[PDB]
Amino acid sequence: FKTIKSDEIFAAAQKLMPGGVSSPVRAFKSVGGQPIVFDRVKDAYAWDVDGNRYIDYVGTWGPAICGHAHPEVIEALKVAMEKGTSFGAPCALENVLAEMVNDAVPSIEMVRFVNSGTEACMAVLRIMRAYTGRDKIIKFEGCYHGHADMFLVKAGSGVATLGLPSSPGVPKKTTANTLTTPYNDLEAVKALFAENPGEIAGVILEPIVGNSGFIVPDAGFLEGLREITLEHDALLVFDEVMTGFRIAYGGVQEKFGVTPDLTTLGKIIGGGLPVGAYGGKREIMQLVAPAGPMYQAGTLSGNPLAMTAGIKTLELLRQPGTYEYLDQITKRLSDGLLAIAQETGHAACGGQVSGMFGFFFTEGPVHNYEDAKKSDLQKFSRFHRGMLEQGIYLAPSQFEAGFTSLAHTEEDIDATLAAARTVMSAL
Amino acid sequence: FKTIKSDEIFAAAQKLMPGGVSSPVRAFKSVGGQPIVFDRVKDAYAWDVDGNRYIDYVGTWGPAICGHAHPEVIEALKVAMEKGTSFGAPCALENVLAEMVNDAVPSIEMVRFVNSGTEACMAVLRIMRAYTGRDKIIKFEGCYHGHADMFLVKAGSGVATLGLPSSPGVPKKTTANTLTTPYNDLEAVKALFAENPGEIAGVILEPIVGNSGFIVPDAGFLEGLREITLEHDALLVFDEVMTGFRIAYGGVQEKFGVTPDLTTLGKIIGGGLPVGAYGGKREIMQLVAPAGPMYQAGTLSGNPLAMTAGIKTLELLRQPGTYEYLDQITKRLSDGLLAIAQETGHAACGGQVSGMFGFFFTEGPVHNYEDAKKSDLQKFSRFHRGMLEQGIYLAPSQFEAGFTSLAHTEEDIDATLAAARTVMSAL
Ligand SMILES: Cc1ncc(COP(=O)(O)O)c(CNC(CN)CCC(=O)O)c1O
Numbered sequence A, B: 001f002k003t004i005k006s007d008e009i010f011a012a013a014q015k016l017m018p019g020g021v022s023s024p025v026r027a028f029k030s031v032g033g034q035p036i037v038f039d040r041v042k043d044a045y046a047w048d049v050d051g052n053r054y055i056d057y058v059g060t061w062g063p064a065i066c067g068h069a070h071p072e073v074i075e076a077l078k079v080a081m082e083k084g085t086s087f088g089a090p091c092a093l094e095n096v097l098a099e100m101v102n103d104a105v106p107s108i109e110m111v112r113f114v115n116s117g118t119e120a121c122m123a124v125l126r127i128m129r130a131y132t133g134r135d136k137i138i139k140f141e142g143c144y145h146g147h148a149d150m151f152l153v154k155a156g157s158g159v160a161t162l163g164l165p166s167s168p169g170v171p172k173k174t175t176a177n178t179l180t181t182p183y184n185d186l187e188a189v190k191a192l193f194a195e196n197p198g199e200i201a202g203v204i205l206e207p208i209v210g211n212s213g214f215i216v217p218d219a220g221f222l223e224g225l226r227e228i229t230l231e232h233d234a235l236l237v238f239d240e241v242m243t244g245f246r247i248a249y250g251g252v253q254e255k256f257g258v259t260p261d262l263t264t265l266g267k268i269i270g271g272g273l274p275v276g277a278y279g280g281k282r283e284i285m286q287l288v289a290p291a292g293p294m295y296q297a298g299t300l301s302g303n304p305l306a307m308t309a310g311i312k313t314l315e316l317l318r319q320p321g322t323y324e325y326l327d328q329i330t331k332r333l334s335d336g337l338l339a340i341a342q343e344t345g346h347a348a349c350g351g352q353v354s355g356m357f358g359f360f361f362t363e364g365p366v367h368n369y370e371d372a373k374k375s376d377l378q379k380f381s382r383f384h385r386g387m388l389e390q391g392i393y394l395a396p397s398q399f400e401a402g403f404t405s406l407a408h409t410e411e412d413i414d415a416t417l418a419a420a421r422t423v424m425s426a427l
């Protein structure tokens, strides 16, 4: 196993971009510091610049639920780029997708497209405040909603992986209106409303965590966040950027039957292109310009290509057996992964909901960021590098949920299980 | 001239999205409402859903400097999407583009890609503050850097340092550190530094305005913004999202020989895909994660499709005669447009630089937003609708710069001039 060519390229990138990457995590710091450069991806696999093949479990971080470079998605894209890659004006495709999204997500009866999760989240945070008139907001430690000032305090992803604290470059005045609290803790939330009466606009959270490792809500937690927000006439926001169209067609809100006021989307609806969206309760969206006073703009927003990738992606996902298959194989890997660690005598706790899972080096049980932080990071490091050499590509971080796609076969699951047994055995 | 099909579609979008558009301007509210829905675009033209053909001067708002659906750009894209539309990891293409961007823009010796102008500007704003440690920022009335909350500050005499939020949903605390002032006003800037000693991190601006109509800097203004910032050891930031690779290969900073500390890019470097970038002075970028402590990350940032469209786009722009041709025809349209208004007897002014121009229905001359606000909007409204019927597509706003592409022929310019004479004549 060699990565000479990746090493060369990455060494050069460090002189061209910050950390030689376009996003922090890709740096591998928290797992070695030697990231691998990709050349192509197909179905459930990824290929080195050194020619190494991998069974990918990162799926470009969520977008590839139908598999990498899906035949029908690419075809729909080629045909589409013939008519232009961007108009900067209205097009029929926006309507189609808007419609599909409305039909898909319950709380969503009116949506607005953007270009990334960060845009959606910073805009939903604004509408959150514009509608209610209150400045303060409540988020959970470990959760992630993009690199927007307000959210940069007890964030997730990279800042929740390789050290990294709140700020810097964010005025204290900013993060002041942001109330943080431990995940899966209704009481902690109930207190934040008491300490700040009439000041909390609403609560935002990942209906299921993926930015602190895989973390699912406890019984009555979501149901509870819905009761307390209503009680204080405050909004409940679901950041389904990662979970949207993955945990279920209608996201976590459809699967666990909890309807929020507003919800953010991204990743999967882009089918592999930069796309985002924030929508929901009609009467709240009307505040969005040019319908309402809340200004929010985007230049490449609703562009033909992205609207096409998304249309085609949701269409593939409407096929029968989609989610059933995903949960089927995802259950095999998780159970099998925790089964293997138990045999090699390594403390670990996993879990999964559909084609999304988690695997912490700590027995748990994990309910919040703190619990998750007990993971043996030095272990995961050796484990991650291990899998890599065995031909398995996993998120270069302990605090990142795992993903599967419709392109992952029963064999891939078994092959991943094999390599895992090999790696852990020598851990 | 009919737009029944566009009316139908837009009527439906208003029930699906806020204002029935993905971005405010698209709603045509400042031109009498009722926008036109596109179906396809090729070279310098655009086509209705009703079949109407137009000589487009919006160019999807900047990205199409090589023309709509450029043959070599599309070909480079198809070939590329075969290897995947997004990896979520490092790839050789990021290095290529980063390199090209570094060679291109002077101030830029290290860059970071993002997905839109808004991401670049909000991140450059953060790095601006993180490097200097100061919270306050100075921008100009009329300029635009995206809907990031701090830029959603009310501008105009009587409220410069009042930092009042010109949009609901954004707290007062945030815009409080946003000091504003009239474009092309060195003294107004010199005062802001006196009233706020040691608190101003830097100045951000459009090296050439495009978001208040076309507005170019007066002699010594940019050179001046560079002296005063150095004097107070503060950063000078050039938002070249619109101007980058359009006013010149190296943007305004190369053409007018003024080098800033940091500079934002977008639009053209995406070749028609959602792309963004903020870079510059090496020692300042190192603060960007994972190199430094400031956090910023994007899931799609650095995706191969966008990196490919951008690579190919800059390559076409490196050909000989590129900018010379652009300035050649853009000069023909501007001069000819002002020549026509003079004849029809219309109060008008404006001009052009490379493939960017402006046209105000006022005697001016124009040096800032106020000056520009004197434009007869009711006139532009009838003028805009007029051009539309004659087969010309212009930005549905008086405060938006005009654009041309390498795909615009001498004939197109002459035909636009023709329709203009026709329209103004009956204005
Ligand atoms: C100098 C400058 N800086 C930042 C931006 C914001 O870029 P985007 O986030 O919207 O890609 C822009 C955006 N420009 C336009 C068209 N003039 C946005 C399109 C719209 O608002 O409809 C800009 O001109």
Ligand SMILES: *Cc1c(COP(=O)(O)O)cnc(C)c1O
Residues within 6 Å of the ligand: A115, A116, A117, A118, A119, A121, A144, A145, A146, A147, A206, A210, A211, A239, A240, A241, A242, A243, A266, A267, B297, B298, B299, B300
């Ligand atoms: C991935 C993620 C984001 C970040 O979205 P970007 O497009 O990278 O800005 C935001 N929220 C959640 C829940 C995510 O998983």
Ligand SMILES: NC[C@@H](N)CCC(=O)O
Residues within 6 Å of the ligand: A023, A024, A025, A026, A061, A062, A144, A157, A210, A211, A242, B088, B089, B297, B298, B299, B300
């Ligand atoms: N939950 C965080 C990841 N989607 C990170 C994606 C990236 O930055 O590339």
